[PDB]
Amino acid sequence: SKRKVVLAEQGSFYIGGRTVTGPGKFDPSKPVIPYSNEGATFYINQMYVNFQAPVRPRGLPLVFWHGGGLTGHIWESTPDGRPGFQTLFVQDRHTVYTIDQPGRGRGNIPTFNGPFGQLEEESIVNTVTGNSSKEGAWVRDRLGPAPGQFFENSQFPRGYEDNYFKEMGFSPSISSDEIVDAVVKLVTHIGPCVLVTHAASGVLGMRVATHAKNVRGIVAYEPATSIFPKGKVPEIPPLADKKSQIFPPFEIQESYFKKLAKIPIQFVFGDNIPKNPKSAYWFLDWWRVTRYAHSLSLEAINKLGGQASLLDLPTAGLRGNTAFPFTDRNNVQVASLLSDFLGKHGLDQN
Template sequence: MKKIVFFTLLLQIMGSLQAQDLVIARQGHFSVGGQTLKHQGEYDNSKFVGWATQVEAGQSYRSDHAFVDFQIPANAHKLPLVYVHGYGGSGVCWQMTPDGRDGFSTLMLRRGWSSYVMDLPGRGRAGRTSAVTTVKPMADEMFWFDIWRMGIWPNYNEGVQFPTDSASLSQFFREMTPDISDHRQDVFSLNALAEQIGEHVLVTHSAGGFPGWMAAIQNKKVRGIVAYEPGGFVFPEGEVPETITGLTGGASGVPVSMEQFEQLLKIPIVMYFGDYIPETLSKNLGDENWRVRLQMARKFVEVVNQHGGNATLVELPKIGIYGNTHFLMQEMNNNKLADLLTDWLIKTF
C-alpha cells in the first residue's frame, strides 16, 4: 500500500512539473500604430439611421493598426522575438499547429524567448482598416495546397512533415483570413512596435519577409532577422539581379539606396528554406514559385556578404532535415526548427 501511495505521489509531482515547465511572467495584447480619421462637422446623437449605416459627421474612426499578442516567460532572454506572418494569414500561424501540437512561438517561449506575435493591419484581429476593398468568398484551397508545396492536389509530397489527416488540413485552411489592407501600414506598424518594446529580433514568414527588411533598414532597434522562406528581397541600386522568370510571375529584387542597404549589413540575418524546391524548371506552380525565390535568396546572401554583412542561408534538406513545406514552422518537426533557431540565437547574441 505504501508503494502504491509513493508512486501515486511521484506521478502527481512529475505531472505537476511537466505542467509548470513553461512559466509566463507577463502576457497580454495591444494595438500599435495606425491612425485616427475624423470627419468634419458636429456629431448629433439624436439621429439613428441603422447599426451598419451611420451619419459620419463629427465622428472618428481608428484604423490601420496592428494587433499584438505578447508573452514574457520567467527568466527570459534579453532580446524578444517579434513574429510577422505572410500573405493570407495572421499571427495565428506562429501560435498553433494544424494537429494541435505546440505552436512555434510556444516552443521558443519554452526555450526562454519572449514573443510578440503580430496581426498586420487589415488581417486577423487588426481588421479595422481605411482601405476600400471588396471581400468575397473565393474557392482557392487546392491552389494554395500546390503553391505551398504540400504536394500536387490531392496527393501529398512523399515524406511530407505536414500532417496529412483531413482534420489537420481543415484546421490549417481555417487559419486563413481575408486581407483587407493596402499594405502601406505594415512597415509603419513594425516600427511603432519597435519604439514601444525596444531592441528585438524579427522573425518573418513568406510575404512578411519584405516588410521585415524595410523595418530593419529604418529602425536600429531591430537587432537581427530570422526569415522563413521570405518572398521578396532588396538589393543596392545598381546591383539588382535580373528577374528570374517562373510560372507564377518570377522573382525580382527591389532596389534601395546603398545607405539603406548598409543598415542590413549591421545585423545578423539567417534564412531557412524547406524541401521540395527544384533547381530546374518545373511544370508545377509550387515548384516554380519557390525555385525562383530560393535562387533570389542565394543572390541576396551573396550580395550582403560581399559588402561585409553577416547573412546565412540554411536549406534544410542540405543539412539532413527533409519533408518541410512552405509552412515549415507549423509542421511535425517544428521542434527541430526551434532547436536550430535557438542555437543560432545563442551563438549570435
C-alpha cells in the first residue's frame, strides 16, 4: 500500500527555550485560579519535535522545517489527504523529524496574564500581531496571479482551498536568534542530519548550518530570504513597481558563511515565476527578484568552493508547481527528486 507505514518507533518531545519569572512568591494556600504572574515561572520559546523512525533506517535523518505561519502538518498530509513527505521518506527508509518551531503550532506562544506577550513590564513578544489573508497567501504561493485564479496546468489540489488555507496562521515576534537556537539544539541531539526547509525557514536553516556541523546537507523549497557575507550583498533591483524591494538579505560574518561551502545545498523552485518584470502582480514580481537574489547567494557559496545548486522543477520536467511543491498533486515526483539529491551525496547510505 502507498499509504502503509511501518515504524520502529515514533514520538514527540519539547526542546530548547528558556524561562522567565514574575514577581513575588507562590503561595499554594491562595486561590490558584484566576491564574497569576505572582511567583510565576514560565517556559517560553520551546520547540515541538515529532519523530518517526523506520525499521532499519538507511542514511541520515531528515528534519523537515515548515515555512512561515505553518506547522509540521504540511509534511504529514496534503490538503486533499494524500501522504506528505513524512510518510514518503519513512517509506524511503529515513528517520523523519518534523518540527513546530517556537511561536508556531505546538511550539510555545509566549504570553502570560496580561496583554498578549507582556509579562508585567517586559514585552516578550509584541501585542500587535500580523497575519496574511487568504488572498495574500493565494498570490504568495503562486496558485494563480489573483485570488480565485489558477495558472494553467496548476498542480495545486484544486477544491481543497479551505483545507489548505486553514493550516496557516500568525507568528509572534520571537527573535529569529531563539528560533535558530532551538533547531541547533535539536541538531546536537540528533547527530548528523539533513535539513529540509521551506520559505521562511530557508534563511533560518542556512543559519543553523553555520552553527552546527551536524547539518550535512540542505534542501530548501522556495526560500524567502537570501543570505550573503556581511558587506558583500550584490546589487539587487527593486521590483517593477519601482518602489518595493524583496526581503532585506541576511548578512553573516564570512567565517560563518564559509561553512555553507562545506555541505551540499540545493534550492528548489516551482513554476510560474516570471522571467520579466510584472508590475501588475506584486508577488509574482517579488518571486522573480527573490529567485535572482538566491542565484547570486548560491554563486557566492560556490565561489568559496561550495556545492550549491538551484533546481527549477520545470527544467526537471515538472510543470505547474506552487510554492508548496511537497503538497502539490505531483508531490511524489517532487519527493523523487529529493531522494535523488540524497542519493547523489550518499546521504541515503549508512
